[PDB]
Design a protein around this ligand. Structure first.
Ligand SMILES: Cc1ncsc1-c1ccc([C@H](C)NC(=O)[C@@H]2C[C@@H](O)CN2C(=O)[C@@H](NC(=O)CN2CCN(c3cc(-c4ccccc4O)nnc3N)CC2)C(C)(C)C)cc1
Lengths: 104, 96, 151, 117
C-alpha cells in the first residue's frame, strides 16, 4: 500500500514513493543512496514534529489518502554534521502572478 | 537511477530517470552525449520554468507513471487556476 | 459504409455502464451509418443496467467538455457474447491525459472562448485552446488507425 | 384544447404505467426498456410497413398527460395494442415476445391493485 513523498531540505526536493508499512529509518536509507549521508546524520519531520526511526510512515500519518502521487506529502529533512544539529529550513517555492481577470 | 532537474530560481528536484523521460524534451536532453566519456546526462537546467511549476511537472511525472496501464479507477490530476497558464506553457515546452 | 459503425445484429445485450470517473459521462452510440447519437448522461459514481445489442459500438465523453474517456482501459466498447444471461460490464474511467491537454481542459474551463486570445501566452496555444475535444475529429483518427492497421 | 380529466384518474393511469415501466424480473433486468421508445422509420422500416398502429410507452405517458385517454380501459387498450404489436413483429419464443406477455400481466395486476384499493 504505497505513499508518495516530497523529501525537502533548503533548495533540494526529492520525489519518491515508499510503503505505508515501511519505516522512517528505511526512508533515510533511500535518502542515503541519493544524497550520500548516513541515517545517523539525518533527521526527518512531518511539519515541525520530528519522526521516530522505529515507527512506520503509516503511524507518522502518511497514508494513501494524504500522500497521493498528484499531491505528495512533504517530509522535512535536516543534516547533523558531527555536533552540528542544523535546524529544519525549507526554501519555499516561487509564487505565480495574480490570476488574470479573464480566468475569474 | 535519479536525475536532478533545476528551476529558473535555482531549486533542485531529484526524481527517478524513467519518470523524467516522460518529457520528450527531457528525453532528448538526457539521451544525447555528455559528461567526458558518457552517453547520457544526470543534471538539467531550466531557464524559463520556476520552482512552483517544475514541482507540479514532477507531480505529474509521478502520476503519469503510477496510473498508466492501471485497472484501478484513475483520480483527476488537479491544477489550480493561478498556476494553470504557466504549467500549460511548461508542458508545451516539455512535450508531455 | 464507414469502418466504425454498429452491426444491426438484432441480438440483445445486457450491459452495466459504470462511471468510475469524476466527470458527468455522455454515452455515445455509433449508429448503423457510423454517426454518433448521444444517450442519457451518467453522474459520477453512478452505474446503470442498459439494453444494447451484440456488435453495437459505444464511446464515452465528458457531457460538458466533450473530453475523451476510457471504457475497460480502451477508447471503444462493443459488448461481447452475453453467455447464460449474466451481463457484460463497461467500466468508464478517466484516461491519463498529457499534462498539456490536462492544462488545456483547466484553462478552457475558467476562460470564455471569446477571451482565449487575451491571455499572456505564446500565439500557438491560442489555437490549441480553440481546437476543442470533438468526437467527429476522433472518429476520423480511430478510423484512419484501423485503416492503417488493415495495411 | 382538451377538457382535463379528474386529477385522481390521471394519477391512477400514471401509477399503473410506472408500475409496468419500472418492473424488473428475477434476474434484475427491466423488461419495459426495449419498448419505451419505438425505432425511427429510417432505423427500422420493416416495423412501420407491417404494424398498422405503432405505439411506444413514451407516447402513452404523453397521452395520459394530454388526457387522450378518458378511462383506465382506454389506457389498457393502448398497452394491449403495444404488446400485440410486439407479438406480431417478434414472433413466439423470442425474449421480446415473452417480455410483452409478462408486461400484459404486470399491467392487469397493477390495474386491479390501484383501481380496487
Ligand atoms: C438510461 C440510459 N442511461 C445511460 S445510457 C441509457 C439508455 C441506454 C439505452 C437505451 C435504449 C433502451 N437502448 C437503445 O436504444 C439501444 C442502444 C444502442 O445499441 C442502439 N439501441 C437500440 O435499441 C436500437 N435497436 C436496434 O438496433 C434493434 N432493434 C430492433 C427493433 N426492436 C424492436 C422494437 C419493438 C418495439 C419498440 C417499441 C414499442 C413497441 C415495439 O414493438 N418491437 N420489436 C422489435 N424488434 C428494438 C431493437 C435502436 C435502433 C435505437 C432502436 C436507453 C437509455
Amino acid at each position: 500500500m504505497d505513499v508518495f513523498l516530497m523529501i525537502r531540505r533548503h533548495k533540494t526536493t526529492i520525489f519518491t514513493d515508499a510503503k505505508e508499512s515501511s519505516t522512517v529509518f528505511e526512508l533515510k536509507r533511500i535518502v542515503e543512496g541519493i544524497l550520500k549521508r548516513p541515517p545517523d546524520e539525518q533527521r526527518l519531520y512531518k511539519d515541525d514534529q520530528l519522526l521516530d526511526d522505529g515507527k512506520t510512515l503509516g503511524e507518522c500519518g502518511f497514508t494513501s489518502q494524504t500522500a497521493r502521487p498528484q499531491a505528495p506529502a512533504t517530509v522535512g529533512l535536516a543534516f547533523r554534521a558531527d555536533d552540528t544539529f542544523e535546524a529544519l529550513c525549507i526554501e519555499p517555492f516561487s509564487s505565480p502572478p495574480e490570476l488574470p481577470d479573464v480566468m475569474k | 537511477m535519479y536525475v536532478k532537474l533545476i528551476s529558473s530560481d535555482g531549486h533542485e528536484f531529484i526524481v527517478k530517470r524513467e519518470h523524467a523521460l516522460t518529457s520528450g524534451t527531457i528525453k532528448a536532453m538526457l539521451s544525447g552525449p555528455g559528461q567526458f566519456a558518457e552517453n547520457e546526462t544526470n543534471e538539467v537546467n531550466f531557464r524559463e520554468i520556476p520552482s512552483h511549476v517544475l514541482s507540479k511537472v514532477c507531480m505529474y511525472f509521478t502520476y503519469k507513471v503510477r496510473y498508466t496501464n492501471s485497472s484501478t479507477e484513475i483520480p483527476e490530476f488537479p491544477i489550480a487556476p493561478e498556476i494553470a497558464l504557466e504549467l500549460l506553457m511548461a508542458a508545451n515546452f516539455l512535450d508531455c | 459504409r464507414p469502418v466504425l459503425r454498429s452491426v444491426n445484429s438484432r441480438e440483445p445485450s445486457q450491459v452495466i455502464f459504470c462511471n468510475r470517473s469524476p466527470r458527468v459521462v455522455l454515452p455515445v452510440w455509433l449508429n448503423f451509418d457510423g454517426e454518433p447519437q448521444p444517450y442519457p448522461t451518467l453522474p459520477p459514481g453512478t452505474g446503470r443496467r442498459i439494453h444494447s445489442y451484440r456488435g453495437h459500438l459505444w464511446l464515452f465523453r465528458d457531457a460538458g467538455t466533450h473530453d475523451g474517456l476510457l471504457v475497460n482501459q480502451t477508447e471503444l466498447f462493443v459488448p461481447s457474447l452475453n453467455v447464460d444471461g449474466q451481463p457484460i460490464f463497461a467500466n468508464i474511467t478517466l484516461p491519463v491525459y498529457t499534462l498539456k491537454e490536462r492544462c488545456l481542459q483547466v484553462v478552457r474551463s475558467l476562460v470564455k472562448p471569446e477571451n482565449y486570445r487575451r491571455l499572456d501566452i505564446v500565439r500557438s496555444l491560442y489555437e490549441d485552446l480553440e481546437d476543442h475535444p470533438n468526437v467527429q475529429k476522433d472518429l476520423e483518427r480511430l478510423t484512419q488507425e484501423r485503416i492503417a492497421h488493415q495495411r | 384544447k382538451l377538457s382535463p380529466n379528474p386529477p385522481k384518474l390521471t394519477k391512477q393511469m400514471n401509477a399503473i404505467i410506472d408500475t409496468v415501466i419500472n418492473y424488473k424480473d428475477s434476474s434484475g433486468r427491466q423488461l419495459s426498456e426495449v419498448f419505451i421508445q419505438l425505432p425511427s422509420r429510417k432505423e427500422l422500416p420493416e416495423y412501420y410497413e407491417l404494424i398498422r398502429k405503432p405505439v411506444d410507452f413514451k407516447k402513452i405517458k404523453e397521452r395520459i398527460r394530454n388526457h387522450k385517454y378518458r378511462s383506465l380501459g382506454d389506457l389498457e387498450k393502448d398497452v394491449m395494442l403495444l404488446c400485440h404489436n410486439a407479438q406480431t413483429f417478434n414472433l413466439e419464443g423470442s425474449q421480446i415476445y415473452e417480455d410483452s406477455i409478462v408486461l400484459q400481466s404486470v399491467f392487469k395486476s397493477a390495474r386491479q391493485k390501484i383501481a380496487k384499493e
